[PDB]
DNA sequence: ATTATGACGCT
DNA sequence: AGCGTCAT
């Protein structure tokens, strides 16, 4: 009872830009804002494959991973912007820069870390408190919550969706005890406001819009963050968890998605996250291991204790191209020549890191699939990074792959390459 | 013939 | 160190 932590010690937000790519885009082109939008990457190959879509485009079912021709067929006067190429691949600098503009916005709130080209989680326990302060017990105003969902209201005692917003958001502020600066879920109701404020200047300042979730922990936030897209946030409380999980597939839990969600399913004879609560961390832990089950017989009861890290800029930088089919490389030349294309983006990267950031890559990972194996990788090698030229590191990268070659000719390539990788990481400070 | 990245866990 | 998982 009083002694059982509840996970209720921090505030968490999770704030993920809407379809990015395609926002990025439409600052940039004015003719395709507010229409059915996706960004792609190359043409030639069935029109090119579709990675961000915008949401009247969604409305017709255009998805990410879809080929354009085919998403032509469910929209025929969809809108299409491709990705810049330079050196003979996909180059994605206008998003990673616009990525910039926004994590540099958010980290005058609060210390966040970065989860993705357009995702971070801010830590906003301390903001929250301060902001307490400032109130001196003042309740807080719905006009000061204007885009705010509350998960789980309105419930008991009308048919628009704002105004069911209104309604879940009056029910919670109206429970709301503003005398205690330590109740967490006036924690929460302040962490939302300035979750507003956060995504106001973030739209003011950039005109990308974006949502939010606002709970105790990532995995909780990440999920509120998903439950009212576009353009909205959510809050989740403690309380509300039993319910919403009560409904939940376990797949929807990031990290859940794969092989280990699949594993919980079928071992356990289980469909909802909620279900976990039935099991004893040590009959977990004996299923998933140790660490997973410790992790799950805490998640399932609302509770996780997974740190925001400090972290506003990537930990490595990395250039890649698939060789599909009868692309892929046969000969000598040709994978010299895309090692060197590769390893020149990879150069002009590092470089405006280290002008940017004040660090030096050190490790040149060097990774290639080959024609037939399944996997990402068929083979991962490291070898040093020692200065960032681009001739440098394509022979190094070749000299550390060389021995795939399973041709007795000098210069043919068996068995031929379906993807080359460069990805510099190891990072000290400069 | 999804593609281009990135984080992170395991041994 | 090199490989596998999860993500998208
Ligand atoms: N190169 C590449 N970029 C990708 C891929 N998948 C996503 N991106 C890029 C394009 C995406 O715009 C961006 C962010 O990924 P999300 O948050 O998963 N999707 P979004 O922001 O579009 O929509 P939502 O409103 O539902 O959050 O990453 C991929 O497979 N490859
Ligand atoms: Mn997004
Ligand atoms: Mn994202």
């Known amino acids: 009872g009083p ?65 354009a021709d085919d998403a032509k067929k469910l929209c025929p006067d969809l809108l299409l912007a491709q990705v810049r190429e330079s050196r003979g691949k996909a180059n994605l600098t206008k998003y990673r820069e616009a990525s910039v503009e926004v994590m540099e916005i958010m980290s005058r709130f609060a210390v966040i870390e970065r989860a993705s080209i357009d995702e971070a989680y801010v830590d906003l326990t301390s903001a929250v408190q301060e902001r307490l302060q400032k109130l001196q017990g003042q309740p807080i105003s719905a006009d000061l919550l204007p885009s705010t969902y509350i998960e789980g209201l309105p419930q008991g005692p009308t048919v628009q969706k704002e105004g069911m917003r209104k309604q879940g958001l009056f029910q919670w502020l109206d429970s709301l005890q503003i005398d205690n600066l330590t109740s967490p879920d006036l924690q929460l109701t302040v962490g939302a406001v300035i979750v507003e404020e956060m995504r106001a200047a973030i739209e003011r300042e950039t005109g990308f819009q974006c949502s939010a979730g606002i709970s105790h922990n990532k995995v909780l936030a990440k999920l509120a963050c998903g439950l009212n897209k576009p353009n909205r946030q959510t809050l989740v409380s403690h309380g509300s968890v039993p319910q919403l999980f009560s409904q939940m597939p376990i797949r929807k839990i990031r990290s859940l998605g794969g092989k280990l969600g699949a594993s919980v399913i079928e071992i356990l004879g289980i469909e909802y996250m909620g279900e976990l609560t039935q099991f004893t961390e040590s009959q977990l832990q004996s299923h998933f291991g140790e660490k997973n089950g410790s992790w ?62 004040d660090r030096v890559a050190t490790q040149l990972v060097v990774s290639i699939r080959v024609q037939g194996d399944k996997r990402l990788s068929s083979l991962r090698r490291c070898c ?47």
Not at 26 to 35: A, I, S, T, V
Not at 389 to 402: E, G, L, P, Q, R
Request: glycine share 6%; with cysteine; aromatic share 10%.
């Open 296 to 357: 799950l017989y805490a998640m399932c009861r609302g509770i996780e204790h997974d740190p925001v890290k400090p972290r506003q800029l990537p930990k490595t930088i990395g250039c890649s191209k698939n060789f599909p089919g009868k692309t892929a490389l046969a000969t000598r030349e040709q994978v010299q020549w895309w090692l060197l294309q590769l390893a020149q983006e990879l150069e002009e990267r590092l470089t405006k890191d280290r002008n940017d950031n």
């Open 384 to 430: 040093a990074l020692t200065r960032y030229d681009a001739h440098k590191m394509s022979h190094d990268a070749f000299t550390v792959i060389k021995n795939c070659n399973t041709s007795g000719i000098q210069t043919e390539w068996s068995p031929p390459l379906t993807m080359l990788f460069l990805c510099a990481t190891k990072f000290s400070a400069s």
């Open 3 to 67: 002694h059982m932590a509840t996970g209720q010690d921090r505030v968490v937000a999770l704030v993920d830009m809407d379809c990015f790519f395609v926002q990025v885009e439409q600052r940039q082109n004015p003719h395709l804002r507010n229409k059915p939008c996706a960004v792609v990457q190359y043409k030639s190959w069935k029109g090119g494959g579709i990675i961000a879509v915008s949401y009247e485009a969604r409305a017709f079912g255009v998805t990410r991973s879809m080929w």
